[PDB]
Amino acid sequence: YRVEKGIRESMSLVHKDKLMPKDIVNSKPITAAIKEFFTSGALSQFMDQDNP
Amino acid sequence: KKKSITQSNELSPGVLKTVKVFVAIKKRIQPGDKMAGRHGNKGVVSRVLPVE
Amino acid sequence: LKGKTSDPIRMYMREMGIVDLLDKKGETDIAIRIEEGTTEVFSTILSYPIVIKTYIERFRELEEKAIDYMNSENEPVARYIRFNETQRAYEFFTNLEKMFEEYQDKPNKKLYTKIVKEFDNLRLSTSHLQKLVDYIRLPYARVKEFERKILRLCVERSKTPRQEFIKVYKVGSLEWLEPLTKKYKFTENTIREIKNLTKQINQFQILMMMDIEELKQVNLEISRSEAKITQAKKEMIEANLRLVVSEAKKYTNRGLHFLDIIQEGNIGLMKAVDKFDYRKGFKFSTYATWWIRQAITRSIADQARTIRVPVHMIETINKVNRIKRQILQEKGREATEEEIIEHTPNMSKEKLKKILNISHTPISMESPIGDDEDSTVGDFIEDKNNYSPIEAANLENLREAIKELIETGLTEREAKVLMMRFGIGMNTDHTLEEVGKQFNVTRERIRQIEAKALRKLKHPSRSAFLKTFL
Amino acid sequence: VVYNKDALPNEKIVEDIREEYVYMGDIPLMTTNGTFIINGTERVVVSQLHRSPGAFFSKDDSEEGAFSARIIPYRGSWLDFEFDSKGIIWARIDRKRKFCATVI
DNA sequence: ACCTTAATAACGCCAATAACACAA
DNA sequence: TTGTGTTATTGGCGTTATTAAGGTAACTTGCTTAT
């Protein structure tokens, strides 16, 4: 959602010749969300490792 | 073994050097620990009597 | 509708989009309106004598502050007076001075027209114009100060009439308070004071012109013209409030919430409207977004943090950030600072070792810690700059120790000397030449006495015991 | 892909014949035993039990016939349709003024 | 996001001066 | 005990690196952010 919403605006700064389809795509709002859910969510606690 | 960041991490900028130390110690049971059989019974070790 | 809704943003948006968007025709119409208003107030200013002589006097101040330079190959540059008129400026000023001399001496009509036309030649936008309107106003301000003051000084003493104002109010007289001998205000000190103030009043008028009605009406006409201009600019700015909100949608979460963003925008707009002349056929919308953007980004850089940070250090950080993203989404690898600098206008290799060391907004002390034994950060910070009741008990055990150690030394003398020369229960820790006078003698062997005391104190009879405290 | 891009005069038909494998992000994989190593710390993501999406009819019976309904969505805002003592079919959107259901 | 300028407070300087020391 | 040598500081000086201020004129006009 976030990255595509940003995509519809990274086309409003055209300055290039034969633009390639790589300058458009962004990455951050994907990892900075996955990683957060993994590192702060209530449903991810240390594995209680007393014994098997 | 050398494809690290020449110091094994991004170091979270601001940090010069760090070291990890690992210490191990045996522990024996003593008056105060807590034993419990599998059948829901439990208690605290109260004394230790000589063999005889 | 006015239906109890509390959050202000709606209560502002409602009124905001009320009045209609306008077209270039209306824009240029209200623009020429403000322009002719300004020319009205301008023209009506310089029709008074002292204005130009004070102008010339300020030029004389710039002349002396220019002569203050060769004391340290042109006329010394300072043109903060006029905008977009120095040899031409100086020469024009010389003509102004001399022709104004002839003006104040001989003529009635002609040379006044000459000076107003050579002023028509000049160009000043809003700064110096306001400088001149204050040139006129401030005198009226000060004389009204003195009027209010003489009132407050006499009216709440002089029988407290407060309604016979028409009799007393005749100003610049100093001929009314003498019957006050046979009236109230037994105010001799006040008498010489109000005479001093009226002296200064007549003196200000002498500097300027005849009585208060020589300036009251000037200020009235100025107020009227300025109100016309103000209404024009208000109508202008009220027409494009929506431009602000439209542009302010990009910067929405960079650190500031929306309302203050909008306010900074409106500042940067209101500042934009008066320096945009219709003389060029263009669109107000084009030029004004520049100022909107300047204001919004400046305010963001200003108050986006608790620990404030200068603005250049922030734009450089933004530049580093854009470079870092560009390379990450191009070569996969992350930092390779060799590359960060290998193509960068930063032109340094150490600032980077500091420009990103300030990259952590302070955590807040009231963040719970999830499970983590159910606590928060705000109860792990502890007092560090005080003396724990042990750190302040191993002191009196020494503060009193030597206070006794010395009591088994000299009879009295070396005690006095060590106290005076080190400072113990004293107030200053006096110096050699002070003890030198304390005993009327021994300007030099006082040092010998202290050396003897110290060599007498470093004996295991007295030394090693204290050695613990270090 | 693009073209002249006039007022639909063969708008996007002719240009941009290339494509590449853009980078997207990072995906944390699980070991063979069902754990994740996050910053070098074995973590486990316990499952979650939650109500199902559909229609649920109940009756908070501090009344008679105080039926209700719910259209539980997988993501969004959930409607309802409550009754009264007399028989009115109200309607609310997750919380609101109680407006009659015939409005929809 | 980029400049083009005054303006300010930290930093290096070598002399002055008040103070300290060290041989008879 | 009085002479000749430091020194420790301390206001002055300049220097400049750092901060604050200001200005662009192709046209651009109203979220609501989510048990």
Asked if C266 CB < 7 A from strand E, the reply is no
Percent helix, strand, coil in chain D, to 5, is 5, 20, 80
User: Is the CB of C11 within 7 Å of strand F?
Assistant: no
DSSP letter, residue C56: H
Closest Cα of chain A to C322: distance in Å?
12
Please report the resolution in angstroms.
3.5
Q: Work out if C245's Cβ lies within 7 angstroms of strand F.
A: yes
The nt closest to C298 (CA vs C1′) is F21
Rounded Cα–Cα distance for residues B41 and C3 (Å): 66
Cβ–Cβ under 8 Å, residues A22 and A10: no
The Cα C268–Cα C298 span in angstroms is 10
Q: Classify C75 as helix, strand or coil.
A: coil
Distance from the A28 Cα atom to the nearest Cα atom in chain D, whole angstroms: 7
Rounded to a whole number, what is the largest CA-CA distance in chain A? 62
What CA–CA distance (Å, rounded) separates C242 from C21?
9
Q: Residue C6, CB, less than 7 Å from strand F?
A: no
Which chain D residues are Cβ-neighbours of A46 within 8 angstroms? 41-43
Helix (H) or strand (E) holding D92: strand D90-93
Q: Do C334 and B10 touch (CB under 8 A)?
A: yes
- Which strand E nucleotides have any atom less than 7 A from protein CB atoms? 1-3, 19-23
Q: Which residues contact C331 (CB under 8 A, 6 or more apart)?
A: none
> Which residues in chain C, range 257-276, keep a C-beta under 7 Å from any nucleic strand F atom?
258, 275-276
Q: For residue C407, how many other CB atoms are within 10 A of its CB? A: 9
**Contact assessment for residue B35 and residue B43, using Cβ atoms and an 8 Å cutoff:** yes
CB < 8 Å & 24+ apart, contacts of B2-5: none
Helix (H/G/I), strand (E/B), else coil: C409: coil
Strand intervals (E) in A1-52:
45-46
Pairing of strands B34-36, D70-71: unpaired
Cα–Cα distance, C282 to C31 (Å, whole number): 12
Q: Which nucleotide lies at the shortest CA–C1' distance from C430?
A: E19
Cα(C330)–Cα(D22) distance, rounded to whole angstroms? 9
Provide the token pair at C185: 């205000």
Among candidates C101, C118, C196, which has minimal Cα distance to C153? C196
Half-sphere exposure of C368 (CA within 13 A, CB side): 5
Contact D65, D83 (CB under 8 A): yes
